[PDB]
């Protein structure tokens, strides 16, 4: 059969968690 | 086709009074075989057991146009009083006595406990007797404002088990067809209780299928011991 | 694009062309309208992003003065409210009630809870506030008795039901578009292929499933009839 | 092919009056078998059950060109008053009585409630009686401004269930073909109620297939007991 | 490349050559434009990059002076709006409104929300502004009354619909091109193989799907008819 | 290498030798020209790398003086522009307009947006600037009225459509090459095997696909006809 | 067969765990 | 056959361990 | 066949090990 109303949102949530992990390592450094 | 046309075409198809070996039948046997073919064909078509069509009661326009002239609708509000049922809230309604199969079936409810849902058109669900005990307390398959359980019993009766009072009983069934009697029969003889001439009431499309089925039935009748 | 183009794209992807089809275009409209909100929430709820202009719709409302509760003296000040119930906005876009001109006026669309307590600031005693009450109407509130003369507003937002807000669509120059199929569907093109894919996946399996086809007072699905 | 050509080709294919054993038919028998072959062939073509063609009513250009001459369009605004239906908002329309299968069926609506959409053409959906109860309330498959439910009932009627008033009822069906009668038949005889000569109204493309099937039916009729 | 080349490339890859085909070139046109927008957003929304001139497209607009709300003395200053509705733009490139010479003039094209509060700065009082209003037209506003005399402008941007902006395209030196199929499709050639692949994948499965062929007052899809 | 060698390599890899073949050499030219730009972008857009000399082409343009908008006095200074529309360059190479001698002269090819504002620097008032307008022509601009006498320039760049820029190819010593098949294809050899692989993969599947072959007023693809 | 009232909750819980892991790395830096 | 009275609790325990691992990395920083 | 008196204990022990690993990272910080 076929339906993506639950897999699409889980994939989107997985990629959102990856998004937050990626942007949580961003730092504007100091001590130049 | 008319009765004269049934007879003439039937004789032509059997090659009656031809030079080759053939079969000649009386108009009474023509009536008998035509009626038998008619009833067998329409039962097979309703049940979907005909291989040539392989289709159910209203599954295509072909079958619609075949059996459209047998479906009759019936209403009744009279309840048979003295009978024994499987529930206190069980009412009994008489069947028109010419029914073969019930295809649509509905009950209208008149109870003060229905609030503003009075006269709610409730579906009549035919239930087996295995399921009845466990369906009485079912809140999804048992009697309700939107459900009525019907059980067949003796004397052509319908036991409607409902939570609310049932005032009316709407139903649509396949009716008895008028038999195909090609000649007013003598005293004593009759087909389905009919003695005079009786024309087929179905559509002309299926008359020829009835004709060929009757021819095959006649051939089987005369050639089942040879 | 219009409702017609999306609907018939879905139908042609599914090849539901015969009039004797189980799944009618109404199923398509329902699925499209729901999956639109689904996709918009999935894309514009995680983190704040630019919402294009295609996702929005303008409804036009006619306001009527109503008592707070009833006609009593002490039942509080009166409110204006839209004559008809208003669609529910999603919380992803830029909702705005404007006085028939988007580039002018200040009518603030706020939450239901906030509008209980607004205008106590002396400099904010002349600002009209809006919210959708649990009644389903858009209620207006302010401390400046001039607001009660307001007669017409237009509300621009990413409404949660495209069908409802399109039915409440504002009159065009030519005139009203009677048929919903001839109105414009509220979604960006970059979200249209995913939307069609989701709807077509939703109805592909059901399209070829068996039916309870025999009229025999029996359930015929276990036998794959 | 004309009636004379039909008879002559029938005789030639049957090898009538040749030296080898053969079959000779009367023009009445030729007419009967030609009509039977015609109607069998077109019904099998419409249902798509012919193994030779294996195509439905309008599934290819060939079948279009075969049954193009039976497609008849019909319009009616009169409603039958006294009938018992399965819903309050049920209207009944007569069928032309020469219909074989309804292929297109649409209904125009006139009601105030659907304002500025008045005169909307509405798709008549033939619906079985199983689905009627659970389709009355269905907002996607039930009656609406763009969809009407038609149920077949007795006496060649069509019960249109609509949420709005139905003003006009349009049809395009397959008609009774005129029989293939090769001679003015004597008194009493007829095919499909027609006694005079009747030429096939279909295209000449299918006349030779009809002739072949009629010949095969003739041999079957003469050679079913030997 | 033109619309014809792309359309017929998709069709020939699908081998939809017979005129008796379920999927006509209009399906192809719709899918191509929607996947164009999809691909452009997928490529140029994550981070900022260079947009080539090929994804850009131009339209000709005729401006008419209109009231803000209606003709009244106190309803605010008038606006200039395009006579016809304007396609929605994609927020990925360099939208620009110019007075028929790209290398001259400063007519800023800003967000609709920003355009309310604009021009108060003393040095920004002679700058002409634009924003596609919820009505669908491109409204113009400025504090220097000379703007109302402006009669005709052009608008370059990466438009949401290639078809809508192609219909509104500027006249060429030779003249107008009557057929949409003879116009230049607005996408870079580096994005064309992905687009053709996506559209062909969209229509490959459906191309071989069963149809409800029989005319029998029945749904024939479950039987794979 | 020439267009002929690449085209016939693709055809022979596919074995499309019969004249009665669905996919003609025109499909091959289209796919080759698009996949060339695709590969060049994929290789020379991530990070800046040396671009060989094979990826470039020289077109020769004939310039004509044109008004900025029309013949009005106050419509600004006039521009030169190429007589015919110019191909769109990719942003990966070293575009350069030169006065028929690559090793001499300074004509700067800049972006459309930049050329609005150039030459205000007093030392840059004699530099000719170039850009492709949305009209599709190459427009020239400078503050030194001597530029308007310029009659011929040649433009060397990695053009986004090999077919267009090859059609505009500069006259050779022997003479013009009429047939495109006899001209030289613009790509480095290290990108040729990948290009052939991509095109052959693109057409391998479609090569053996079924056709709607029966002329019967019917779609015959669902039946794999 | 099919019923996803326990698969859905477990996938949602897995994504919640991964989200909490992602946001637990976030810091607002100092020493500029 | 089918029974989830042992797999459900093991999955729940796995997700509980993931929960505790995720929340054990949470820190409220100092030195601003 | 089937008997889960050793699979159950090993899965439970694995989850115990993973739980001990999780809780062993927990700290109550200092230096505010």
Swiss-Prot record, chains A, G, H, I:
Cellular location(s): Virion; Host membrane
Domain of life: Viruses
Subunit structure: Homododecamer. Interacts with the portal protein.
Function: Protein that is stored in high quantity in the viral capsid and may play a role during ejection.
Protein name: Cargo protein 1
Originating species: Bacteroides phage crAss001
Portion of the full sequence shown: 214 to 245 of 842
Curated annotation (Swiss-Prot), chains B, D:
Signal peptide extent: none
Record keywords, A-Z: Virion
Protein's UniProt keywords contain Metal-binding: no
Main location: virion
Location in or out of the cell: Virion
GO CC, any one term: virion component
Subunit organization: Homododecamer.
Function according to Swiss-Prot or TrEMBL: Forms the tail multi-ring barrel with ring protein 1, ring protein 2 and ring protein 4.
Note: The barrel is composed of five stacked dodecameric ring structures. Podoviridae-like phages usually possess only one such ring. The tail is thus rather long.
Full protein name: Ring protein 3
UniProtKB/Swiss-Prot annotation, chains C, E, F:
Chief localisation class: virion
Record keywords: Virion
Subcellular location per the Swiss-Prot or TrEMBL entry: Virion
GO cellular component, one term: virion component
Residue segments, region Disordered: 206-225
Keyword RNA-binding: no
Subunit structure: Homododecamer.
Miscellaneous note of the record: The barrel is composed of five stacked dodecameric ring structures. Podoviridae-like phages usually possess only one such ring. The tail is thus rather long.
Task of the protein: Forms the tail multi-ring barrel with ring protein 1, ring protein 3 and ring protein 4.
Protein name: Ring protein 2
Originating species: Bacteroides phage crAss001 (Bacteroides phage PhiCrAss001)
């Amino acid at each position: 059969f076929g339906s993506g109303a639950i897999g699409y949102e889980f994939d989107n949530r997985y990629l959102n968690n990856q998004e937050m992990s990626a942007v949580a390592k961003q730092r504007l450094t100091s001590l130049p | 086709m008319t009765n004269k046309e049934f007879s003439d075409g039937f004789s032509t198809l059997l090659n009656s009074f031809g030079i080759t070996p053939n079969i000649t039948l009386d108009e009474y046997e023509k009536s008998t075989f035509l009626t038998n073919a008619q009833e067998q064909l329409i039962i097979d078509i309703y049940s979907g057991r005909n291989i040539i069509y392989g289709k159910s009661f209203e599954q295509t326009e072909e079958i619609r146009r075949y059996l459209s002239n047998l479906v009759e609708t019936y209403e009744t509000s009279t309840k048979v009083t003295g009978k024994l049922g499987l529930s206190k809230d069980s009412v009994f309604f008489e069947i028109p006595q010419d029914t073969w199969f019930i295809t649509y079936e509905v009950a209208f409810l008149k109870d003060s406990r229905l609030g503003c849902l009075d006269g709610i058109e409730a579906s009549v669900v035919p239930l087996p007797q295995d399921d009845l005990y466990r369906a009485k307390d079912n809140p999804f398959r048992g009697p309700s404002k939107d459900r009525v359980l019907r059980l067949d019993i003796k004397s052509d009766l319908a036991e409607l088990i409902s939570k609310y009072n049932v005032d009316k009983y709407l139903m649509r069934y396949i009716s008895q067809p008028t038999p195909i009697i090609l000649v007013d029969l003598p005293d004593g003889l009759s087909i389905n209780g009919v003695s005079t001439e009786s024309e087929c009431e179905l559509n002309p499309v299926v008359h020829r299928a009835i004709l060929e089925r009757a021819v095959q039935l006649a051939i089987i009748s005369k050639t089942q011991l040879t | 694009m219009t409702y017609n183009e999306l609907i018939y794209m879905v139908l042609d992807e599914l090849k539901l062309s015969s009039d004797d089809s189980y799944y009618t275009p109404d199923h398509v409209i329902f699925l499209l309208v729901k999956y639109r909100s689904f996709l918009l929430k999935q894309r514009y709820s995680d983190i704040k992003k630019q919402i294009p202009d295609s996702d929005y719709q303008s409804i036009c409302l006619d306001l009527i003065e109503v008592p707070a509760i009833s006609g009593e003296p002490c039942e509080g000040s009166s409110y204006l409210r839209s004559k008809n119930k208003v669609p529910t906005t999603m919380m992803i876009g830029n909702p705005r009630v404007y006085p028939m001109d988007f580039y002018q006026g200040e009518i603030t669309y706020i939450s239901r809870d906030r509008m209980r307590y607004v205008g106590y600031n002396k400099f904010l005693r002349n600002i009209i506030y809006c919210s959708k009450a649990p009644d389903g109407y858009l209620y207006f509130k302010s401390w400046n008795p001039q607001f009660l003369h307001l007669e017409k507003v237009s509300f621009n937002a990413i409404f949660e039901d495209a069908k409802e807000a399109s039915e409440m669509a504002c009159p065009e120059e030519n005139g009203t578009i009677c048929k919903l199929e001839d109105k414009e569907f509220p979604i960006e093109d970059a979200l249209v292929p995913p939307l069609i894919e989701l709807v077509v996946k939703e109805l592909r399996g059901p399209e070829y499933s068996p039916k309870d086809e025999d009229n025999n007072a029996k359930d015929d699905l276990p036998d794959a009839r």
